[PDB]
Structures are given as C-alpha cells and as structure tokens.
Structure 1
Amino acid sequence: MLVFIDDGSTNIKLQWQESDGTIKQHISPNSFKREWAVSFGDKKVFNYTLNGEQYSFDPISPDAVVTTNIAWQYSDVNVVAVHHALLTSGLPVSEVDIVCTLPLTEYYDRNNQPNTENIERKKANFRKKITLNGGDTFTIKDVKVMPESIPAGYEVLQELDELDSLLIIDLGGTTLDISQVMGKLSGISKIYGDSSLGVSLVTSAVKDALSLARTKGSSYLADDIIIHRKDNNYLKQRINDENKISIVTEAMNEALRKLEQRVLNTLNEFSGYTHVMVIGGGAELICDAVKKHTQIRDERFFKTNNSQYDLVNGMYLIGN
C-alpha cells in the first residue's frame, strides 16, 4: 500500500488507490489535546501515546494544540496527526509506504535544490514510535518527500509550452507557499515561503471573537465558522451569544482584508508568469482578489472546486 499524505499543519490530506484501482481521498483535521479523552456511550475516542506523552483527537477543546508553525513539520504531534488520519481513513491497519510533503523553503535551498538535511529530518520524524490505546496503529515503512505547492500544477503544466510559466499560489493554515514553474515542469524560476502568512491570521482572530461570544473552542471550530461564513443560519446555530455575531463576522472580515493585502503585496514580487493557479484551503478566500490583481486573462486562471486537495491529488497523479 502506497498512500499520498499531504500532511499540512491544519489538515492531513490523504489520497491512495484501492485494490480495484479506484482513487480515494480523506481529510483529517489536526485538533489534538495533550490528554486522553473520555468515552461516553457510543463515542469512539482515539487516545495515543508518543514518547511518554498522551494525546487524543479532540475537535472542540479550546486546549487543542495550536500547530500553526514550521516546527510542526518535524514535531511529535505531526506523527500523531498522520497516524490518526490513517486510522480514520477507512484503510485497514497495515504497513504502508507514504509520500509526504514539506513547505517550499524547507524542501529547497536558496538555489532550488533539495535540502537533503531537512528532507531526511522529515523522513526520520515518522520513525518515532507511537501507541494507540486499545488498538493497533499502521506501521509506516518507506517515506519519500515532495515539495508543497508545485505538485498541484502537474496536469496544467502538461499542456503548457516550456516558455510559459505558472504561478502556483498555495495558501494554507500556516504558510503562503508560492512557486513559479516553467511549462512541462522543465524548470523552477522562483520559490517563496512565508510561514507567518497563513489563514491562521483569520483563524486566530475568529477564535478570540468566539471566546468573547462565549463559544470557547478549538482552532478547528473557528475554521469551521470561517468555512461557513456565508451561512447566517449556521453562524446563528453555532455562536452562543446571539448578541455578538457581528463581533465574530467583523473580526473575521478585518483579518480577511489583512490576509488579502498581505497576499497581494507578496505577488508584486513575482514577474513574467503567463499562468496563475491558486490552491489550498485558503484559495477560497483569496482567489477573486488574486485573479483581479494579476490581470491574467480568464482562460489562464486556475482554481478547482476542491482546492484543499489540489496538492495531494497532484502528488498522486505524479507518483502513483
């Protein structure tokens, strides 16, 4: 079994092919607290131990570990998150080989050549031993690494002359990863990583607002509100203090404007790209402003209906 694991700070995305050749996808939010959870009734809890420390998957706790940083790539929580994603995917527990991911600036030196040091640090992290309480964990056999952003442009780069270049803008929870890549993947003009520019800018602001509105929860719940920002009834069902909905929506709106302006300023630093692609969960939030800011003709702008999965799908199309 070979499983493609785009292991992002916010969500693990999995893609893999079944025995009968059908392709499956699974997403798994990285919300874990440093304590075992308690099972009541029909609730199956996932309690893990790694290096003498206990964790549980907990989607609602305000004490869920905040994972919005570079260190997380090689962290213990990462290993828990990836095992948990495997254990909730529907695949039978087993040995597996995996292809995981690194941020551009971790995967590449300033010359756009692999940073074998960091690439190996990544592979070694998945050697850490982990226990699931009252159950068996998958065993992680062979580990290979790919860069983030770039693999998502695979299909599009195929029908692109080697003179054209595609700007792939990957906005995740922690990091803005930008790459400019020549047609047929014949070259890489430029990479760029900003690990202080993520949707967490918004997540963090929404989380604080929710707490003020007496809806104290995890980063995940805050993201859940960002995802449903356009649904006033959803907002009204989730947010406890009915009198403070505008505090959440406006806090969200201001951080979104900040997100936008910061992202657009970053684009000003690229030039000569003929095509523009926007991928990641953040794509939904910035795609209009990007298309507009780049004056790229409609046909040269690329945005899928499942932006969060663009990367892991590309990893699959390439490496499976």
Structure 2
Amino acid sequence: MLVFIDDGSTNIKLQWQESDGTIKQHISPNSFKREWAVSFGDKKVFNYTLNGEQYSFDPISPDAVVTTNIAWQYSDVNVVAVHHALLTSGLPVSEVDIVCTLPLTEYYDRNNQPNTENIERKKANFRKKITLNGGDTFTIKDVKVMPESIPAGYEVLQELDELDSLLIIDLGGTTLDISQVMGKLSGISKIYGDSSLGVSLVTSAVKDALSLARTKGSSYLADDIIIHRKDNNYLKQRINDENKISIVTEAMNEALRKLEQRVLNTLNEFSGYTHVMVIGGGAELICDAVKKHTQIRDERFFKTNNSQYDLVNGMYLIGN
C-alpha cells in the first residue's frame, strides 16, 4: 500500500487507492501532547511510545487548532501524527510505503537545488519505531519526500511543453510560496518563500476595524466581509451601521493594496515564465493584480483552486 501524505502545519491529509480502484481521502488533526492520557474506560484514548517518550492524541476544539512551525516537520510528534492518521483512516494495519512533504524552502536550498540534508533528515524521522497501548500500529517502510506547493499544479504542468515555464503563485493564510517550474515537472528553475505574507494581513485589518473579539467566530465574520467586499448590501445586512461599513471598507481596501504591492514586488524577482497559475486560499484576492502585472494571455493563466485535497491529490497523480 502506497499512501500519499500532506503532513502540513495544521493537520494531516491522506490519499490512497484501494484494491479495486477507488481513491480515498482522509484528514486527521495535529493535536498531540507529551503525556499519557488517562481513561476510566469511558472514552477512547490513544497512548503512544515512540523513541522513548510517550505521547497521546489530545482532542481539542476544532476552533483552537494550533499552527506548527518548520522544526515540527522533523519532530517525534510529526511521526505520531502521521501514524495516528493511518490508524483512523480506515486502512487496515500493515506495512506501508509513504510520500510526505517538506515546505518549499525546506525542500530546496537558496540555490534552488533540493536540500538533500533536510530531505534525508525528514526520511530518517519516520524510521523511529512506534507502539500503541491496546493495539498494533502500521509499519512505515519506504519514504519519499515531495515539496509542498508544486504538486498542486501538476495537472496543469502535465499539458505544458517541457520547454515551457510555469509560475506557480500560492498565497495562503499566513504564507506566500512562489516557484517557477519547467513543463511536465521536468525541473525547477527558481523557488521563493515568504513566511510573513498572507491573507491574515487583510483579515487582521478587518478584525481590528470592527473591534472583533479574538474568537474564531469573528474570523468567519471577517472572512465573509472580505468575500462579499463588493456587495454593499451584504455588508449593511451584516455590520449594522453605515459608518462602520465605511470604516471597515477602507481599512480592507488599504490592506488589499498593500497585499497586492508586496506580492508583485516578489514576482518582480522572477522572469522567463511562459504560463502563470494562482492558487491558495488567497488566490481570489490577488488574481486580477497578477494578471494585469504579468500581462499573460488567458489561455496561459490558471486558477485551479478546487479543495483542501489539491496538494495530496497532486502528490498522488505524480507517484500513484
């Protein structure tokens, strides 16, 4: 069994192909604590032992998900989170070969060449043996690693000429990933990552202009205000105050301009691309500005955003 794994900063997504031919997907949390979870036998608990330390699944509010850092990708918890996903996936316990991920700037070095040191370190991490109290665990055999953003653009790359060059612009909640890839994924010419640029720049500007609480509830409100920014009636309906509307609107417009400018300034470091692709949760917010700035023709511009499984699905298409 070959399992494709998107072990990102907020959760674990799996994709694999069953005996017949059906493609299955699964998502699991990244919430684990460094201690034994006790049960009086009333609720289900997962107690693990990895290198020496013990760990347990720590179920928390789907509203308090913690975003992890780069170092997390080489930790014990990373390994436990993957094994836990396999255990709750539905797959039968067994030996499995896997493909996991490393962030763009971790997979590649500043010379745009694959950083062998990091990749090998990622692979060695899954060699640690794991046990589960009260049951058995999967056994990870072969481990391959893929960079994060690029697989999401494979479907498009597949139809490009190897001499063609695709500029993949991936704007997320808190980060920006840009990479120039040769047609059919026949090579990489340049990679660029910014960890302080994302949709949050606009979201925080909105939360601040409304004095919204820190609750995730205000996050949804802010998300909605951004989504429906051009529909003044939607807003009047939401924010009850013509004055608040004007205030939130210009704070939002100001934040978006700064967003567009910062993204374009980074794009100014790339050159030689023939096709452009914009993806990520913030794709809608910069779509127009990049199209105008790159002056690329419509048949050479792509917006393949579909779902949260885009990445792992792309990984699947590449190495199924």
Same fold (TM over 0.5): yes
Moved more, 105-114 or 18-27: 105-114
- Distance change (3 Å), C-alpha of 1:94 and 1:150: same
Cα-to-partner distance string for 1:230-277 (whole Å, 9 max, x where unaligned):
999999999999999999999999877766554343223222322222
Select the structure of larger CA radius of gyration: 2
- Distance change (3 Å), C-alpha of 1:240 and 1:118: farther
| Residues 48 and 56, structure 2, Cα contact 8 Å, conserved in 1 | yes
- Distance change (3 Å), C-alpha of 1:114 and 1:130: same
- Distance change (3 Å), C-alpha of 1:243 and 1:96: farther
- Distance change (3 Å), C-alpha of 1:183 and 1:314: same
Deviation at residue 162 of structure 1 after TM alignment: 3.5
- Distance change (3 Å), C-alpha of 1:214 and 1:186: closer
Cα-to-partner distance string for 1:2-42 (whole Å, 9 max, x where unaligned):
00112111222211111001112222232334455566998
- Partners of 1:224 and 1:215 lie apart in 2 by 15
Cα-to-partner distance string for 1:133-175 (whole Å, 9 max, x where unaligned):
4333222111111222222322212221334311112345664
Moved more, 12-21 or 272-281: 272-281
Deviation at residue 100 of structure 1 after TM alignment: 1.0
- Partners of 1:207 and 1:58 lie apart in 2 by 29
What is the aligned partner in structure 2 of residue 36 from structure 1?
A: 36
| Residues 105 and 193, structure 2, Cα contact 8 Å, conserved in 1 | yes
| Residues 33 and 56, structure 1, Cα contact 8 Å, conserved in 2 | yes
Normalising by the residue count of structure 2, what TM-score does the alignment of the two structures yield? 0.74
| Residues 202 and 256, structure 1, Cα contact 8 Å, conserved in 2 | yes
Q: 3-state DSSP class of the match of 2:14?
A: strand
Moved more, 244-253 or 264-273: 244-253
- Partners of 1:272 and 1:209 lie apart in 2 by 41
- Partners of 1:82 and 1:242 lie apart in 2 by 49
Cα-to-partner distance string for 1:187-235 (whole Å, 9 max, x where unaligned):
3221112234456768999999999837489999999999999999999
**Count of residues in correspondence between the two structures:** 320
Deviation at residue 97 of structure 1 after TM alignment: 0.4
Cα-to-partner distance string for 1:73-107 (whole Å, 9 max, x where unaligned):
11222112212221222212221100111122222
Moved more, 114-123 or 291-300: 291-300
| Residues 61 and 217, structure 1, Cα contact 8 Å, conserved in 2 | no
What is the aligned partner in structure 1 of residue 97 from structure 2?
A: 97
- Partners of 2:31 and 2:228 lie apart in 1 by 19
Matches within 5 A, 1:147-296: 147-172=147-172, 175-197=175-197, 213=213, 215=215, 261-283=261-283, 286-287=286-287, 290-291=290-291, 293-296=293-296
Structure 2: gaps (5+ residues): none
- Partners of 1:226 and 1:77 lie apart in 2 by 35
Cα-to-partner distance string for 1:34-92 (whole Å, 9 max, x where unaligned):
45556699854444444454544445359978443211111222112212221222212
| Residues 10 and 65, structure 2, Cα contact 8 Å, conserved in 1 | no
| Residues 279 and 303, structure 2, Cα contact 8 Å, conserved in 1 | yes
Deviation at residue 109 of structure 1 after TM alignment: 2.8
Normalising by the residue count of structure 1, what TM-score does the alignment of the two structures yield? 0.74
- Distance change (3 Å), C-alpha of 1:165 and 1:240: same
- Partners of 1:40 and 1:241 lie apart in 2 by 52
| Residues 283 and 307, structure 1, Cα contact 8 Å, conserved in 2 | no
| Residues 280 and 305, structure 2, Cα contact 8 Å, conserved in 1 | no
Q: 3-state DSSP class of the match of 1:16?
A: strand
Instruction: Percent identity, please.
Output: 100
- Distance change (3 Å), C-alpha of 1:263 and 1:82: farther
Q: 3-state DSSP class of the match of 1:316?
A: helix
Deviation at residue 185 of structure 1 after TM alignment: 2.8
- Distance change (3 Å), C-alpha of 1:208 and 1:319: farther
Structure 1: gaps (5+ residues): none
- Distance change (3 Å), C-alpha of 1:9 and 1:214: closer
Deviation at residue 305 of structure 1 after TM alignment: 4.5
